[PDB]
Design an enzyme around this catalytic site. Structure first.
Site, short mmCIF file in Angstrom:
data_model
loop_
_atom_site.label_atom_id
_atom_site.label_comp_id
_atom_site.label_asym_id
_atom_site.label_seq_id
_atom_site.Cartn_x
_atom_site.Cartn_y
_atom_site.Cartn_z
N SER A 31 43.91 35.17 41.65
CA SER A 31 43.26 36.36 42.75
C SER A 31 43.41 35.07 43.79
O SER A 31 42.52 34.20 43.90
CB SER A 31 42.16 36.52 41.75
OG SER A 31 41.12 36.68 42.78
N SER A 32 43.91 35.72 45.49
CA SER A 32 43.77 35.66 46.58
C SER A 32 41.64 34.95 46.71
O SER A 32 41.30 34.30 47.49
CB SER A 32 43.94 36.66 47.69
OG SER A 32 43.15 37.32 47.55
N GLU A 61 56.28 40.62 47.04
CA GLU A 61 55.17 40.06 47.69
C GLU A 61 54.13 38.87 47.29
O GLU A 61 53.84 38.02 47.64
CB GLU A 61 54.54 41.07 48.67
CG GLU A 61 55.22 41.39 49.86
CD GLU A 61 54.56 43.37 49.93
OE1 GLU A 61 55.17 43.69 51.52
OE2 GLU A 61 53.50 43.38 50.26
N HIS A 83 40.57 52.84 41.81
CA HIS A 83 41.98 53.06 41.78
C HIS A 83 42.45 53.55 40.72
O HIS A 83 41.96 53.47 39.50
CB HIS A 83 42.47 50.87 41.93
CG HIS A 83 42.05 50.40 42.65
ND1 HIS A 83 41.83 48.37 42.54
CD2 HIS A 83 41.07 50.06 43.74
CE1 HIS A 83 41.49 48.32 43.07
NE2 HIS A 83 40.79 49.34 44.74
O1 LIG Z 1 43.66 40.99 45.85
P1 LIG Z 1 43.44 40.07 45.56
O2 LIG Z 1 42.06 39.51 46.26
O3 LIG Z 1 44.11 38.85 45.65
C1 LIG Z 1 42.74 40.06 43.60
P2 LIG Z 1 41.04 41.45 43.24
O4 LIG Z 1 41.77 42.27 44.57
O5 LIG Z 1 41.31 41.90 42.27
O6 LIG Z 1 40.14 40.66 44.36
C2 LIG Z 1 39.25 41.36 43.89
C3 LIG Z 1 38.04 40.55 43.59
O7 LIG Z 1 38.70 40.61 42.08
P3 LIG Z 1 39.06 39.26 41.40
O8 LIG Z 1 38.79 37.99 42.34
O9 LIG Z 1 38.67 38.83 39.38
O10 LIG Z 1 41.26 39.84 41.32
C4 LIG Z 1 36.51 41.05 42.96
O11 LIG Z 1 36.50 39.72 42.40
P4 LIG Z 1 34.56 40.23 42.35
O12 LIG Z 1 33.24 40.14 42.75
O13 LIG Z 1 34.30 39.80 40.24
O14 LIG Z 1 34.33 41.32 41.06
C5 LIG Z 1 36.31 41.39 44.66
O15 LIG Z 1 36.35 40.79 45.26
P5 LIG Z 1 34.47 39.88 45.62
O16 LIG Z 1 33.36 39.08 44.68
O17 LIG Z 1 35.01 38.29 46.72
O18 LIG Z 1 34.22 40.21 46.63
C6 LIG Z 1 37.15 42.26 45.59
O19 LIG Z 1 36.30 42.80 46.61
P6 LIG Z 1 35.80 43.85 47.09
O20 LIG Z 1 34.40 43.97 47.41
O21 LIG Z 1 36.63 44.93 46.29
O22 LIG Z 1 36.62 44.27 48.70
C7 LIG Z 1 38.03 41.61 45.85
O23 LIG Z 1 39.58 42.46 46.17
P7 LIG Z 1 39.86 42.20 47.43
O24 LIG Z 1 39.44 43.06 48.54
O25 LIG Z 1 40.65 41.24 47.75
O26 LIG Z 1 41.32 43.24 47.19
#
Ligand SMILES: O=P(O)(O)CP(=O)(O)O[C@H]1[C@H](OP(=O)(O)O)[C@@H](OP(=O)(O)O)[C@@H](OP(=O)(O)O)[C@@H](OP(=O)(O)O)[C@@H]1OP(=O)(O)O
EC number: 3.6.1.52
Length: 134
Positions: A31-32, A61, A83
């Site tokens: 995860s980023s 990508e 989603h």
């Molecule tokens: O595209 P990425 O980052 O490589 C992988 P992801 O989509 O699963 O990450 C999500 C992350 O999911 P994860 O890191 O577990 O993959 C989740 O983490 P959660 O807080 O545990 O729900 C949330 O991150 P934050 O905690 O930083 O807000 C999401 O933020 P949103 O509020 O939905 O915008 C992230 O969504 P993003 O905006 O990065 O696409």
């Protein structure tokens, strides 16, 4: 540009990137937002972009792999995030060394036995763990 179904769910595509036609090992990426977490590579579909085309583009990508597109597994909703994801099988034939998300955000990739992929996805990504239920 983000795209949406008529019910407002964000349109996404992902691949189960298998090491071989035996489908015993799958590629996950970090995860980023949380680099200690593993996810199935995928992302948003572009306007008028076929889901199979989006899935191949997104794994290039995010994971730096190319291969032979196989079957649609299914269409999976993440209700919490609104989603809707098309999930395809991809049999990896090319592993590229300096791919977009490695260069740009240091995204990692790792092969997992299917049982272990399900284990590491269960807590944060139970819908992604369900991609493997068949
Ligand atoms: O595209 P990425 O980052 O490589 C992988 P992801 O989509 O699963 O990450 C999500 C992350 O999911 P994860 O890191 O577990 O993959 C989740 O983490 P959660 O807080 O545990 O729900 C949330 O991150 P934050 O905690 O930083 O807000 C999401 O933020 P949103 O509020 O939905 O915008 C992230 O969504 P993003 O905006 O990065 O696409």
């Amino acid at each position: 540009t983000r795209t949406y179904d008529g019910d407002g769910y964000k349109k996404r595509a992902a691949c189960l990137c298998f090491r071989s036609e035996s489908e015993e090992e799958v590629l996950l990426v970090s995860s980023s937002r949380h680099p200690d977490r593993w996810i199935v590579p995928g992302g948003g579909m572009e306007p008028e972009e076929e889901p199979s085309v989006a899935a191949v583009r997104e794994v290039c990508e995010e994971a730096g792999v190319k291969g032979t597109l196989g079957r649609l597994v299914g269409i999976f909703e993440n209700q919490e995030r609104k989603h809707r994801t098309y999930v395809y099988v991809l049999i990896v034939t090319e592993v590229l060394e300096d791919w977009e998300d490695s260069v740009n955000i240091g995204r990692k990739r790792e092969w997992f036995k299917i049982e272990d992929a399900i284990k590491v996805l269960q807590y944060h990504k139970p819908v992604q763990a369900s991609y493997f239920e068949t």
